[PDB]
Amino acid sequence: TTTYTIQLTGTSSGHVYELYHIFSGDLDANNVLTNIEWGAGVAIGDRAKFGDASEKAASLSGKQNDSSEVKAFAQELSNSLSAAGRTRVRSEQGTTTISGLKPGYYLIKDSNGSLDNVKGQAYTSIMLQVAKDTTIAIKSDVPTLTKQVKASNSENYISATDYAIWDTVPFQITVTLPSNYGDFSKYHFSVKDSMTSGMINNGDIQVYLQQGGSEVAITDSFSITTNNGLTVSIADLKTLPNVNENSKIVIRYTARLKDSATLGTTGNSNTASLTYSNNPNNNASTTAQTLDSRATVYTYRLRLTKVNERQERVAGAGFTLYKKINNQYSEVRKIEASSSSTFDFYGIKAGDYKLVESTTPAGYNTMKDIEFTITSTIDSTGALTDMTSTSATATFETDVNRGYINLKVVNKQGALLP
Ligand code: NA
Numbered sequence: 001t002t003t004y005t006i007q008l009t010g011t012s013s014g015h016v017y018e019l020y021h022i023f024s025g026d027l028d029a030n031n032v033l034t035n036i037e038w039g040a041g042v043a044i045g046d047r048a049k050f051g052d053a054s055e056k057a058a059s060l061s062g063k064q065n066d067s068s069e070v071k072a073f074a075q076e077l078s079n080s081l082s083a084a085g086r087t088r089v090r091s092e093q094g095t096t097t098i099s100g101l102k103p104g105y106y107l108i109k110d111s112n113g114s115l116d117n118v119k120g121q122a123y124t125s126i127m128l129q130v131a132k133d134t135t136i137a138i139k140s141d142v143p144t145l146t147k148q149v150k151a152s153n154s155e156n157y158i159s160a161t162d163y164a165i166w167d168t169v170p171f172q173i174t175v176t177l178p179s180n181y182g183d184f185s186k187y188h189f190s191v192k193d194s195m196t197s198g199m200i201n202n203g204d205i206q207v208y209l210q211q212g213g214s215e216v217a218i219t220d221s222f223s224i225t226t227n228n229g230l231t232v233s234i235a236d237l238k239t240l241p242n243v244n245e246n247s248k249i250v251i252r253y254t255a256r257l258k259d260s261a262t263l264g265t266t267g268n269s270n271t272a273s274l275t276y277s278n279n280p281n282n283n284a285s286t287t288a289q290t291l292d293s294r295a296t297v298y299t300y301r302l303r304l305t306k307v308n309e310r311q312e313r314v315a316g317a318g319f320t321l322y323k324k325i326n327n328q329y330s331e332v333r334k335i336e337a338s339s340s341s342t343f344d345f346y347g348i349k350a351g352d353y354k355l356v357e358s359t360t361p362a363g364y365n366t367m368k369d370i371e372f373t374i375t376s377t378i379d380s381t382g383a384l385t386d387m388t389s390t391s392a393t394a395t396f397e398t399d400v401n402r403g404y405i406n407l408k409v410v411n412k413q414g415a416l417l418p
Contacts, residue, residue: 008095010094013091013092016089016111019041020041021040022039024103025103036053041082049080060073078282108127117288119288122279123280125281141179143178145191147173163349171253171295172250173191173252177249181243185238186236195270210250261346272293273289299403303345305409307408309412320334350374352372370393371392373389374389375388
């Protein structure tokens with residue numbers, strides 16, 4: 001006899017695909033099926049409710065694979081299956097091949113319960129396929145979620161950057177929808193974000209529908225809660241009619257660093273994941289969760305220690321920190337004079353700065369202004385690898401791991417000229 005192959009592309013490891021023999025027959029060179037009977041994949045009891053196999057086949061002849069009558073037949077068959085005509089195949093990553101199939105029409109699905117509570121997976125849309133030695137794409141996909149933060153020094157969104165205490169930290173979660181979104185009757189959609197422990201959320205969260213190079217706000221259609229992380233949910237995304245398989249859902253919000261934010265290489269991280277409907281068949285209500293997407297924000301502490309040439313600690317200095325925008329230095333932080341001899345500028349980032357001694361301790365020369373540059377090196381993985389602090393007129397000591405930048409300001413007395 002003759003046997004045929006179905007090769008499924010876009011498959012993932014960890015699945016068990018089932019092929020049910022719906023129709024037997026003979027396949028010609030034009031992929032036309034003759035001499036049609038019911039295959040063993042359809043339970044004998046349920047066959048009579050479809051009628052004669054040949055005439056059922058004839059009624060579908062020439063219709064689109066994604067036409068309504070064929071989708072209907074697939075879903076009805078799914079409740080009429082028999083193990084008698086079943087072939088189970090463990091999936092491979094990329095491409096899964098099933099050879100030695102009896103000729104005819106097959107129903108393809110994921111084995112029941114095989115993906116329950118498995119992250120980043122979904123049950124395939126039930127497929128009807130003629131076994132004809134060809135490759136087809138599995139009608140299965142998962143949504144993706146990416147959490148990003150706006151780069152400190154540009155407009156683009158990346159996984160990690162550095163920020164200062166005076167900055168607003170913009171975050172952006174981008175969700176893509178599965179290619180088979182249309183097959184779902186309803187679509188559960190819930191984004192959970194851990195938020196960042198060393199930051200305060202500004203509560204300015206908005207949700208956008210992004211497609212065709214444009215954005216529309218859809219925030220009011222979502223439930224936005226803070227009982228279990230920051231959660232942004234809609235019971236059924238299908239109630240938004242302009243959302244489709246090619247739509248992107250984008251969540252934006254901003255935060256700001258606390259004065260207790262983690263310094264140095266550990267960073268201040270948050271993770272986000274999506275909970276989604278993972279089975280488009282039989283109006284199912286099971287969900288799965290995407291893997292976490294992480295974003296990180298680094299920051300440093302600049303410490304000044306005010307001393308004199310006698311190596312004594314000196315109180316009563318005051319410092320004004322400027323950061324360079326263009327050619328224009330702009331005041332970002334001031335520490336007024338006190339009994340303190342230490343000055344902590346907690347939450348500083350890469351950039352060009354100027355430090356001014358706005359108040360000089362009694363009986364000492366005013367320090368000359370110090371211009372300095374902080375650099376941050378963040379590798380492709382988003383890890384902070386290096387940090388430096390340098391000036392043409394001063395020396396800093398740095399600890400990249402702890403995120404410390406230390407400057408000793410040496411106060412010197414004037415001249416007694418008798
Ligand atoms: Na799959």
